[PDB]
Amino acid sequence: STAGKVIKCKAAVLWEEKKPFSIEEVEVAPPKAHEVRIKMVATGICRSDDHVVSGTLVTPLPVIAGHEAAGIVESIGEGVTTVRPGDKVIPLFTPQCGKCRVCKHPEGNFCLKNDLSMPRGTMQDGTSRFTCRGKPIHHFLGTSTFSQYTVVDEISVAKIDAASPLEKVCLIGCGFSTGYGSAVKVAKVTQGSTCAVFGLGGVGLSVIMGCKAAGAARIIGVDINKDKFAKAKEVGATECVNPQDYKKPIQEVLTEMSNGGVDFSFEVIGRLDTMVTALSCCQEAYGVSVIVGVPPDSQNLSMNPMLLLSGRTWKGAIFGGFKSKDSVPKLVADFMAKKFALDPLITHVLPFEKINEGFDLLRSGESIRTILTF
Amino acid sequence: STAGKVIKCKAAVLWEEKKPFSIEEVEVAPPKAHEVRIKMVATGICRSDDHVVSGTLVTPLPVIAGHEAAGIVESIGEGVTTVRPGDKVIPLFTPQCGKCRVCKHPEGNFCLKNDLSMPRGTMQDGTSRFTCRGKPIHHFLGTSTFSQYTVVDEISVAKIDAASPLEKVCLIGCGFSTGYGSAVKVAKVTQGSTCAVFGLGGVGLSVIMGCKAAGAARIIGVDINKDKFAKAKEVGATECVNPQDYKKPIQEVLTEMSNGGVDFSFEVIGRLDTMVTALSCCQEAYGVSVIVGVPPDSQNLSMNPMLLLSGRTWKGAIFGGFKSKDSVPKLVADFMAKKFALDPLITHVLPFEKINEGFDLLRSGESIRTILTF
Ligand SMILES: NC(=O)c1cccc([C@@H]2O[C@H](COP(=O)([O-])OP(=O)(O)OC[C@H]3O[C@@H](n4cnc5c(N)ncnc54)[C@H](O)[C@@H]3O)[C@@H](O)[C@H]2O)[nH+]1
Ligand SMILES: NC(=O)c1cccc([C@@H]2O[C@H](COP(=O)([O-])OP(=O)(O)OC[C@H]3O[C@@H](n4cnc5c(N)ncnc54)[C@H](O)[C@@H]3O)[C@@H](O)[C@H]2O)[nH+]1
Ligand SMILES: [Zn+2]
Ligand SMILES: [Zn+2]
Ligand SMILES: [Zn+2]
Ligand SMILES: [Zn+2]
Numbered sequence A, B: 001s002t003a004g005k006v007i008k009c010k011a012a013v014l015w016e017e018k019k020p021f022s023i024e025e026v027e028v029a030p031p032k033a034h035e036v037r038i039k040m041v042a043t044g045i046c047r048s049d050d051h052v053v054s055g056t057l058v059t060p061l062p063v064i065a066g067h068e069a070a071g072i073v074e075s076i077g078e079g080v081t082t083v084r085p086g087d088k089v090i091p092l093f094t095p096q097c098g099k100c101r102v103c104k105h106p107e108g109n110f111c112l113k114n115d116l117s118m119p120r121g122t123m124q125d126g127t128s129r130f131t132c133r134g135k136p137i138h139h140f141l142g143t144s145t146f147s148q149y150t151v152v153d154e155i156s157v158a159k160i161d162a163a164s165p166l167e168k169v170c171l172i173g174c175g176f177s178t179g180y181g182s183a184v185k186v187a188k189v190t191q192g193s194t195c196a197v198f199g200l201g202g203v204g205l206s207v208i209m210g211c212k213a214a215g216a217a218r219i220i221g222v223d224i225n226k227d228k229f230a231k232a233k234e235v236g237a238t239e240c241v242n243p244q245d246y247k248k249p250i251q252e253v254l255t256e257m258s259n260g261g262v263d264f265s266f267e268v269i270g271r272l273d274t275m276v277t278a279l280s281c282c283q284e285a286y287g288v289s290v291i292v293g294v295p296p297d298s299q300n301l302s303m304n305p306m307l308l309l310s311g312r313t314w315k316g317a318i319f320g321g322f323k324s325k326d327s328v329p330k331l332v333a334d335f336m337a338k339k340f341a342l343d344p345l346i347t348h349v350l351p352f353e354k355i356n357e358g359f360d361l362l363r364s365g366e367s368i369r370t371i372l373t374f
Helices: A047-054 A175-187 A202-214 A228-235 A250-258 A272-280 A324-337 A352-364 B047-054 B169-173 B175-186 B202-214 B226-235 B250-257 B272-280 B324-336 B352-363
Strands: A007-014 A022-028 A035-044 A068-076 A088-091 A149-153 A157-159 A194-198 A218-222 A239-241 A264-267 A288-291 A301-303 A313-316 A346-348 A369-373 B007-014 B022-028 B035-044 B068-076 B088-091 B130-132 B135-137 B149-153 B157-159 B194-198 B218-222 B239-241 B264-267 B288-291 B301-303 B313-316 B346-348 B369-373
Touching: A007 A352, A022 A149, A022 A352, A035 A088, A047 A352, A157 A324, A175 A202, A175 A264, A175 A288, A175 A324, A194 A202, A194 A250, A194 A272, A202 A218, A202 A228, A202 A264, A218 A228, A218 A250, A228 A239, A239 A250, A250 A272, A264 A272, A272 A288, A272 A301, A346 A352, A352 A369, B007 B130, B007 B352, B022 B149, B022 B352, B035 B088, B035 B169, B047 B352, B068 B169, B088 B169, B157 B324, B169 B175, B169 B324, B169 B369, B175 B202, B175 B264, B175 B324, B194 B202, B194 B272, B202 B218, B202 B226, B202 B264, B218 B226, B218 B250, B226 B239, B239 B250, B250 B272, B264 B272, B272 B288, B272 B301, B352 B369
Parallel strands: A194 A218, A194 A264, A218 A239, A264 A288, A288 A313, A346 A369, B194 B218, B194 B264, B218 B239, B264 B288, B288 B313, B346 B369
Antiparallel strands: A007 A022, A035 A068, A035 A149, A035 A369, A068 A088, A088 A157, A301 B301, A313 B313, B007 B022, B022 B130, B035 B068, B035 B149, B035 B369, B068 B088, B088 B157, B130 B135
């Protein structure tokens, strides 16, 4: 609650990998110059949060994970000029400093001030802003939303429409904007095409949302979990295929299906093998494959270059190509206009304290987006 | 000489790999329906022909190689509607049947009627047209220009300007069009950019011509053969770097000098390691790397997918993305208009019978384009 100094509150501290979170009490310092303390209204559980724990996404531990969320501004640090206190806002795991090459470039969005390439697990000041027990707790992507309170740089915050249903709109902070932006922005799906999506999770379903918004005539969802098929078709898919039903490789099954290959295929899972399979399954001469999943730390994939030579283009993208600070508020306005719907991504809405359970729903395959309410 | 039936002539027969070409006599059968027999005026020695002999580019032996050339039409088979006898023309290693998905696709150029991905070593009808000693000989890419006379399908030949200088314009059938097409068509270099070119041979120098035509503000040519630098700077390079001069990895060097990365990188060598290196030396968030070199048969390259997650786009292409039959004629016209120049690429012009020598000049790094005259 209200302040101008240290706050004590609950947070999901992750002490070690392959362990559960420990909802604990933390001291959340006040916002320094150019930072903001935000009161977390709702939080989505993205697979990336799960990667931290399983050790596939290496970041410094202990740490308060969480990054897909929406909240309200409790206070503002010296100089902040973009968000006033009481404003509904959305943190940003991909900032938008406005000064580096990337923010200046009309196309790139992966700002040089991100904490994803090389995790420090600190604030821009290179300092923390959390303490549990006596020890300091690392940040995550300069967001860390698994806490009632958090403080992010002005660089990583976006003022959102006052009438926003923060319990829906938090998805736009990762899951949706990524998948929808991969399809409509990075890959640039065209009316009439035929896409293929690998991974029918929250982002996967969001890519199908983009393709369908882009006008793809066919949308082949691929997943080893038959249960994901209905949500898929509901949001946009035209058919769904499960690798395990076939006696011949999926790229073969897909090429045959597409009469030679896909127009645009997407890897929204995270494994090396499916990264290649997604590439190979697209048209050798003009197919585009967009890598969306995040692979396992320091692992190299092997693929034969002829796949590229023929004319295939392989792209990768973070946050769906979107320039964070400009995009999110604009995206929210669209949600308002009803130009899209986040409902189909939402399958559970547990309360913060049951975080470990929402993660269990993920890894078991019975959920999609599970919204932690605070 | 003129006919309507078998013609006996000279040709460079490749009997086995890692062996010299054998200049000998062949019976070049007359053109079947929709085929064309052509009299070879001039031919260029492209690195690919050399791959064949090294075994890097697996194609069936024995074979009459060659693919970049211009000639005049001796005879035409039944139904031919595009070229008459006496027209100056250019065979095309990249077909353009006009009926397949690719040819119909406004963007892709790699025709489904090509013999590059799955080298048969025949004509469209699955039959040869060359007989040496007593046994039949395979064709190459459906062109095979290292013969005084050859027969190409109507789909693999382009009629070019009657007044075109065939011993210059032959370069347009491969080396030029690909290098120039990679940069202007494929990667779409932009005014002001900073491009980097791996390999300063015929195709590379043509890419430098592309980048410069596109308006790149900086073009850094990389090559281990110091000798290649003057010509490179000559065609448009702004600077030249040689891997062996530095004590630190080339991508690190390029990135440091380009202030965090190049806008467009090109790989025109065909080496696996430099295919990755060229990828990594480009801007993490918006860099585009186009692979142009042709890799060693069945070899897989290992690379960290995170490289693409950041935002990089990896492209690959054959014939610079130019749609063959419609492009060549138009490009030739541009030559005539003095829209570009092939002269700098030509450093030797040996007579056909000196083929094995022109090949030595390649392997010894002292040539670029050695035009063989017939
Ligand atoms: N680059 C970015 O901006 C960005 C954004 C968001 C998430 C990510 C990454 O993308 C990935 C997925 O995100 P999510 O939607 O939250 O995760 P999720 O766990 O909800 O979905 C994973 C889906 O993949 C399916 N899948 C898994 N294995 C296979 C397989 N072997 N073959 C076929 N299908 C399979 C699985 O059944 C599930 O439906 C994950 O790797 C995450 O780290 N990156
Ligand atoms: N994709 C297509 O449609 C297409 C068209 C034309 C050529 C090609 C392929 O492109 C490749 C280049 O053709 P080229 O220009 O005719 O051959 P080339 O020998 O003239 O050019 C190769 C250049 O690579 C340089 N070089 C070699 N090793 C290295 C290295 N380790 N690091 C840096 N530089 C090095 C070498 O000095 C030379 O200047 C060749 O492999 C050919 O098979 N592909
Ligand atoms: Zn996420
Ligand atoms: Zn920035
Ligand atoms: Zn060539
Ligand atoms: Zn075709």
